[PDB]
């Protein structure tokens, strides 16, 4: 679902956010427009996934991450 989240530059349309400043960890923004912009705790096997999250991709690790390939990625 996303009907007031990523949509919450738009204050003026949408004020649902109200309910996500509620927890007080709004303000954080982390959660506001680009939840994912900083993966890492999200395992991948193919790159494909961390390029869909926007974060970077794959790496040595199966993590998302800005994948630095040492000699390629054997995952």
Do not use: N, Y
């Not at 303000?27 to 869909?52: I, L, M, N």
């Amino acid at each position: 679902m996303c009907e007031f989240i990523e949509d919450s530059e738009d204050i003026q349309g949408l004020k649902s956010l109200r309910k996500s400043h509620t927890s007080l960890e709004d303000d954080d923004d982390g959660s506001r427009g680009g939840d994912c912009e900083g993966c890492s705790g999200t395992a991948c096997s193919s790159d494909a996934q961390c390029r869909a999250r926007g974060c970077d991709g794959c790496s040595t690790s199966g993590v998302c991450v800005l994948s630095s390939l040492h000699h390629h990625h054997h995952h």
